[PDB]
Design an enzyme around this catalytic site. Structure first.
Site, PDB file in Angstrom:
ATOM      1  N   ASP A 174       2.220  -5.616   1.286  1.00  0.00           N
ATOM      2  CA  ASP A 174       2.306  -6.724   2.243  1.00  0.00           C
ATOM      3  C   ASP A 174       1.058  -7.603   2.205  1.00  0.00           C
ATOM      4  O   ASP A 174       0.095  -7.350   2.935  1.00  0.00           O
ATOM      5  CB  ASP A 174       2.574  -6.155   3.649  1.00  0.00           C
ATOM      6  CG  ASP A 174       2.860  -7.233   4.677  1.00  0.00           C
ATOM      7  OD1 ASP A 174       2.869  -8.421   4.325  1.00  0.00           O
ATOM      8  OD2 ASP A 174       3.088  -6.882   5.841  1.00  0.00           O
ATOM      9  N   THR A 175       1.100  -8.664   1.381  1.00  0.00           N
ATOM     10  CA  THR A 175      -0.024  -9.597   1.277  1.00  0.00           C
ATOM     11  C   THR A 175      -0.287 -10.324   2.586  1.00  0.00           C
ATOM     12  O   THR A 175      -1.380 -10.871   2.768  1.00  0.00           O
ATOM     13  CB  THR A 175       0.223 -10.622   0.159  1.00  0.00           C
ATOM     14  OG1 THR A 175       1.433 -11.374   0.414  1.00  0.00           O
ATOM     15  CG2 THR A 175       0.351  -9.923  -1.195  1.00  0.00           C
ATOM     16  N   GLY A 176       0.696 -10.358   3.490  1.00  0.00           N
ATOM     17  CA  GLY A 176       0.542 -10.985   4.792  1.00  0.00           C
ATOM     18  C   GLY A 176      -0.139 -10.128   5.849  1.00  0.00           C
ATOM     19  O   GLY A 176      -0.443 -10.631   6.934  1.00  0.00           O
TER      20      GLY A 176
HETATM   21  C1  LIG Z   1       1.356  -5.419   9.908  1.00  0.00           C
HETATM   22  C2  LIG Z   1       0.207  -6.142  10.624  1.00  0.00           C
HETATM   23  C3  LIG Z   1      -1.116  -5.510  10.189  1.00  0.00           C
HETATM   24  C4  LIG Z   1       0.303  -5.994  12.141  1.00  0.00           C
HETATM   25  N1  LIG Z   1       0.213  -7.547  10.245  1.00  0.00           N
HETATM   26  C5  LIG Z   1       1.275  -8.476  10.594  1.00  0.00           C
HETATM   27  O1  LIG Z   1       2.220  -8.162  11.231  1.00  0.00           O
HETATM   28  C6  LIG Z   1       1.158  -9.898  10.149  1.00  0.00           C
HETATM   29  C7  LIG Z   1       0.924 -10.762  11.397  1.00  0.00           C
HETATM   30  C8  LIG Z   1       0.774 -12.228  11.015  1.00  0.00           C
HETATM   31  C9  LIG Z   1       0.554 -13.021  12.350  1.00  0.00           C
HETATM   32  C10 LIG Z   1       1.866 -13.176  13.130  1.00  0.00           C
HETATM   33  C11 LIG Z   1       2.924 -13.861  12.270  1.00  0.00           C
HETATM   34  C12 LIG Z   1       3.233 -13.020  11.011  1.00  0.00           C
HETATM   35  C13 LIG Z   1       1.943 -12.740  10.180  1.00  0.00           C
HETATM   36  C14 LIG Z   1       2.348 -11.783   9.028  1.00  0.00           C
HETATM   37  N2  LIG Z   1       2.426 -10.333   9.459  1.00  0.00           N
HETATM   38  C15 LIG Z   1       2.675  -9.471   8.307  1.00  0.00           C
HETATM   39  C16 LIG Z   1       4.100  -9.708   7.815  1.00  0.00           C
HETATM   40  O2  LIG Z   1       4.201  -9.327   6.471  1.00  0.00           O
HETATM   41  C17 LIG Z   1       5.085  -8.922   8.673  1.00  0.00           C
HETATM   42  C18 LIG Z   1       4.997  -7.434   8.323  1.00  0.00           C
HETATM   43  C19 LIG Z   1       6.215  -6.675   8.848  1.00  0.00           C
HETATM   44  C20 LIG Z   1       7.251  -6.344   7.983  1.00  0.00           C
HETATM   45  C21 LIG Z   1       8.354  -5.659   8.462  1.00  0.00           C
HETATM   46  C22 LIG Z   1       8.420  -5.296   9.799  1.00  0.00           C
HETATM   47  C23 LIG Z   1       7.383  -5.617  10.660  1.00  0.00           C
HETATM   48  C24 LIG Z   1       6.280  -6.307  10.185  1.00  0.00           C
HETATM   49  N3  LIG Z   1       6.432  -9.416   8.418  1.00  0.00           N
HETATM   50  C25 LIG Z   1       7.175 -10.094   9.468  1.00  0.00           C
HETATM   51  O3  LIG Z   1       6.712 -10.246  10.551  1.00  0.00           O
HETATM   52  C26 LIG Z   1       8.583 -10.568   9.145  1.00  0.00           C
HETATM   53  C27 LIG Z   1       8.973 -11.756  10.003  1.00  0.00           C
HETATM   54  C28 LIG Z   1      10.333 -12.185   9.476  1.00  0.00           C
HETATM   55  N4  LIG Z   1      10.453 -12.602   8.098  1.00  0.00           N
HETATM   56  O4  LIG Z   1      11.284 -12.162  10.173  1.00  0.00           O
HETATM   57  N5  LIG Z   1       9.467  -9.446   9.417  1.00  0.00           N
HETATM   58  C29 LIG Z   1      10.372  -8.954   8.403  1.00  0.00           C
HETATM   59  O5  LIG Z   1      10.411  -9.462   7.331  1.00  0.00           O
HETATM   60  C30 LIG Z   1      11.230  -7.754   8.808  1.00  0.00           C
HETATM   61  C31 LIG Z   1      11.923  -6.984   7.877  1.00  0.00           C
HETATM   62  C32 LIG Z   1      12.649  -5.917   8.315  1.00  0.00           C
HETATM   63  C33 LIG Z   1      12.693  -5.608   9.659  1.00  0.00           C
HETATM   64  C34 LIG Z   1      13.440  -4.510  10.120  1.00  0.00           C
HETATM   65  C35 LIG Z   1      13.464  -4.216  11.478  1.00  0.00           C
HETATM   66  C36 LIG Z   1      12.752  -4.992  12.387  1.00  0.00           C
HETATM   67  C37 LIG Z   1      12.012  -6.076  11.938  1.00  0.00           C
HETATM   68  C38 LIG Z   1      11.996  -6.373  10.564  1.00  0.00           C
HETATM   69  N6  LIG Z   1      11.265  -7.435  10.123  1.00  0.00           N
END
Ligand SMILES: CC(C)(C)NC(=O)[C@@H]1C[C@@H]2CCCC[C@@H]2CN1C[C@@H](O)[C@H](Cc1ccccc1)NC(=O)[C@H](CC(N)=O)NC(=O)c1ccc2ccccc2n1
Length: 198
Positions: A124-126
């Site tokens: 997860d590059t994000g």
């Molecule tokens: C993991 C953590 C260290 C907390 N970092 C982060 O969460 C940062 C926060 C940043 C500021 C807020 C806006 C998003 C960015 C990117 N994110 C990372 C970023 O990569 C984040 C990681 C992730 C993946 C899957 C499930 C949860 C969380 N992805 C997401 O937030 C994207 C948003 C979207 N496309 O709808 N979520 C999903 O792609 C996704 C996939 C499967 C799922 C299954 C069940 C429930 C939720 C699910 N969400």
């Protein structure tokens, strides 16, 4: 361009006549932009992340330029703190993850070994941090709160933990708590030489 992950992988985007910065996010299924002025019809949608859900406006077949690369796809607009470019658009600009080369038509999942246990996790590059589902780990931890797209969750912080990521060993900080997906964030991606290429 090749991109290492010692810093957030930010790019300039142009969308709706406007210039913005956005995060190249291999961990995001969708592309989600802060509230902004776009033209045309849209549908309401709910999307989940760490912390919970947000309501967004769904715009389909939107033209976006990502560091000078053009793509047409779905863009979601709503209360996100960071503009994120997700895999739906990353594939259109030939983005690959290298550490094995990995395209992004599917979630970039890897096997990890941590605390003697085998698990699957998302490259997860994000993500600034590495966050794993509830699991048994030994040793002292510290409480912490971390934010995602839906809000905040409480995690346990473990420092200097050995993880094997697809056979590559790294030592660093791992957070454990109610995430729905195990996430390998940039603190560990750098240690296995992960790069973004497009
Ligand atoms: C993991 C953590 C260290 C907390 N970092 C982060 O969460 C940062 C926060 C940043 C500021 C807020 C806006 C998003 C960015 C990117 N994110 C990372 C970023 O990569 C984040 C990681 C992730 C993946 C899957 C499930 C949860 C969380 N992805 C997401 O937030 C994207 C948003 C979207 N496309 O709808 N979520 C999903 O792609 C996704 C996939 C499967 C799922 C299954 C069940 C429930 C939720 C699910 N969400």
């Amino acid at each position: 361009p090749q991109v290492t992950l010692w810093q957030r992988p930010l790019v300039t985007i142009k969308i709706g006549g406007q210039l913005k910065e956005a995060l190249l996010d291999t961990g995001a299924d969708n592309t989600v932009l802060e509230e902004m002025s776009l033209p045309g019809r849209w549908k309401p949608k709910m999307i989940g992340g760490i912390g919970g859900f947000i309501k967004v406006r769904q715009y389909d077949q939107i033209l976006i330029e990502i560091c000078g690369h053009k793509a047409i796809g779905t863009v979601l607009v709503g209360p996100t703190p960071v503009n994120i470019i997700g895999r739906n658009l990353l594939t259109q600009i030939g983005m690959t993850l290298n550490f094995p080369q990995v395209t992004l038509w599917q979630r970039p999942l890897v096997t990890i070994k941590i605390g003697g246990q085998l698990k699957e996790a998302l490259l997860d590059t994000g993500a600034d941090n590495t966050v794993l589902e509830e699991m048994s780990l030994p040793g002292r931890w510290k409480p912490k709160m971390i934010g995602g797209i839906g809000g905040f969750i409480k995690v346990r912080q473990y420092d200097q933990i050995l993880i094997e990521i697809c056979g590559h060993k790294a030592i660093g900080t791992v957070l454990v708590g109610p995430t729905p997906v195990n996430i390998i964030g940039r603190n560990l991606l750098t240690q296995i030489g992960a790069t973004l290429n497009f």
